[PDB]
Amino acid sequence: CPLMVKVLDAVRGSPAINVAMHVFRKAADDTWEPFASGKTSESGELHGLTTEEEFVEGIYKVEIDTKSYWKALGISPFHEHAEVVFTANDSGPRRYTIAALLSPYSYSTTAVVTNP
Amino acid sequence: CPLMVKVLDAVRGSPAINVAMHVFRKAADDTWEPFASGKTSESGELHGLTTEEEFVEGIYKVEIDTKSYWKALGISPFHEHAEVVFTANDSGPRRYTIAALLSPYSYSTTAVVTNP
Amino acid sequence: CPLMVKVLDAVRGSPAINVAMHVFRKAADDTWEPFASGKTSESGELHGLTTEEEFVEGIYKVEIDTKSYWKALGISPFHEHAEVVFTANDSGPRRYTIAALLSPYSYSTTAVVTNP
Amino acid sequence: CPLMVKVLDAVRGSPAINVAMHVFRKAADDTWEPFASGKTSESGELHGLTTEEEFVEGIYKVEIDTKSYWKALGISPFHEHAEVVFTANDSGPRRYTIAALLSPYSYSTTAVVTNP
Ligand SMILES: Cc1cc(OCC(=O)O)cc(C)c1Cc1ccc(O)c(Cc2ccccc2)c1
Numbered sequence: 001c002p003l004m005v006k007v008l009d010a011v012r013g014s015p016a017i018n019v020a021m022h023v024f025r026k027a028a029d030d031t032w033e034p035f036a037s038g039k040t041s042e043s044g045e046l047h048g049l050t051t052e053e054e055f056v057e058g059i060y061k062v063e064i065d066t067k068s069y070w071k072a073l074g075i076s077p078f079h080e081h082a083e084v085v086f087t088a089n090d091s092g093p094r095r096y097t098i099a100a101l102l103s104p105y106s107y108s109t110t111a112v113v114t115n116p
Numbered sequence: 117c118p119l120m121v122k123v124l125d126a127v128r129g130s131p132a133i134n135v136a137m138h139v140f141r142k143a144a145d146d147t148w149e150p151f152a153s154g155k156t157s158e159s160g161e162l163h164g165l166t167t168e169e170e171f172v173e174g175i176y177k178v179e180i181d182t183k184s185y186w187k188a189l190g191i192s193p194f195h196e197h198a199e200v201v202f203t204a205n206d207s208g209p210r211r212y213t214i215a216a217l218l219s220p221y222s223y224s225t226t227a228v229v230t231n232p
Numbered sequence: 233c234p235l236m237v238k239v240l241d242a243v244r245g246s247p248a249i250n251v252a253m254h255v256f257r258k259a260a261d262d263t264w265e266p267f268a269s270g271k272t273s274e275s276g277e278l279h280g281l282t283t284e285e286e287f288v289e290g291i292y293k294v295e296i297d298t299k300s301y302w303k304a305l306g307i308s309p310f311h312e313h314a315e316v317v318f319t320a321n322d323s324g325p326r327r328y329t330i331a332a333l334l335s336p337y338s339y340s341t342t343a344v345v346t347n348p
Numbered sequence: 349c350p351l352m353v354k355v356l357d358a359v360r361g362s363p364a365i366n367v368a369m370h371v372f373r374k375a376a377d378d379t380w381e382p383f384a385s386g387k388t389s390e391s392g393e394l395h396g397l398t399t400e401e402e403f404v405e406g407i408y409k410v411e412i413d414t415k416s417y418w419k420a421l422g423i424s425p426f427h428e429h430a431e432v433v434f435t436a437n438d439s440g441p442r443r444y445t446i447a448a449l450l451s452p453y454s455y456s457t458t459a460v461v462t463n464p
């Protein structure tokens with residue numbers, strides 16, 4: 001996987017399961033073009049969003065539907081969603097893991113970038 | 117002062133000074149309208165973005181220009197920016213502090229919401 | 233005021249109020265001597281732990297009683313406490329703010345160190 | 349593994365490699381008895397610290413030598429180490445992943461607790 005997302009839940013102490021997210025690439029006219037999506041597995045992971053050949057340089061956005069997640073748990077959340085916006089592959093193809101830790105009024109996101 | 121933003125630098129253990137950010141409000145037609153902007157002070161704070169009367173119910177986005185902050189320090193960070201998107205004043209007027217902690221490959225955001 | 237602690241609750245989006253904590257200093261014989269203690273205010277802050285004259289060079293530990301905080305809210309959290317252990321004033325007197333963000337299964341801590 | 353530790357580096361955007369840590373169990377006299385240790389792999393992971401039979405109820409401390417890690421990178425750190433103190437297995441055996449995200453002046457720790 002050139003791109004993987006891992007989401008944890010800081011209230012339950014667990015992977016965050018069935019969290020939906022969409023991935024966008026910024027177009028030449030500065031709009032966001034959606035191109036992939038999925039929901040996290042029982043281990044809080046989403047794999048298989050893109051392939052090496054398709055995942056060219058550019059600016060990418062991952063929009064994580066954290067609000068639906070907290071709603072499903074009966075917990076009032078602050079954010080509409082969690083975004084991660086980044087330039088990919090600036091100096092060549094990299095493997096990216098986006099890690100997110102969710103609380104109702106806070107989130108953190110981190111990137112693990114490895115050169116395959 | 118109903119909306120304040122505080123930004124810290126996790127590398128230097130300091131306020132993040134001179135960090136630009138723009139606030140937007142979602143309009144009735146669903147586009148992001150410019151709402152306010154400013155840069156953090158020497159204490160990493162930005163106050164005076166809005167007033168109670170102007171800060172009506174709605175979905176607000178704060179886009180924090182973290183990339184320029186890192187680039188000015190010589191660092192090429194992962195994120196293009198840090199976004200915070202939230203519904204405000206859904207249950208009457210509240211005071212919001214958005215707190216952000218910055219590292220080159222990670223950021224966290226939290227909200228303190230108080231009732232005046 | 234050379235040492236201040238600020239504690240936020242990531243579940244409620246509020247200061248963490250009435251959080252007890254104890255500060256220790258490592259002694260010449262390597263044991264932890266009691267240094268100061270207190271509980272956070274309604275603003276999640278604890279000030280007045282020490283003075284510039286008393287806060288000499290050394291290794292200090294702040295043990296924050298996060299378990300009691302969660303238990304009083306009905307929650308059985310993961311951590312017994314949050315610890316912050318650091319060398320202080322190694323390069324002359326500094327002002328330290330210890331910031332902690334709490335969730336039932338996670339906590340984060342950061343330091344803001346300023347030169348007066 | 350009943351106990352795994354995963355450490356990431358928020359400055360380099362990578363697993364935190366060759367981070368040493370020690371694990372202690374609290375004794376009846378309230379002292380900490382060390383019983384396991386290791387250093388993180390190239391993927392920032394430490395496995396094999398204990399076995400199901402040995403990992404009985406009690407209070408456990410993981411002391412992560414973050415200071416040596418930052419020193420090895422030529423970066424000035426704030427903390428002496430990062431601690432994680434928790435009661436294990438309170439309601440039966442669980443699998444524990446302790447996740448830590450490191451910055452020079454901040455760290456976060458989270459637990460993923462799964463029932464095997
Ligand atoms: C626990 C784990 C399993 C995991 O499995 C997938 C794999 O091994 O590739 C991957 C990662 C990066 C992790 C670590 C992790 C997950 C979410 C996350 O936000 C972080 C960073 C973090 C850690 C502690 C507190 C706040 C943030 C690490």
Ligand SMILES: Cc1cc(OCC(=O)O)cc(C)c1Cc1ccc(O)c(Cc2ccccc2)c1
Nearest residue numbers: 215216217224225226238240331332333340342
């Ligand atoms: C909101 C605030 C009020 C505050 O009042 C006291 C003062 O102004 O000195 C001080 C600080 C450092 C803060 C910011 C703050 C509080 C806790 C805390 O963990 C952090 C770092 C952080 C920020 C976002 C997500 C995780 C961690 C900052």
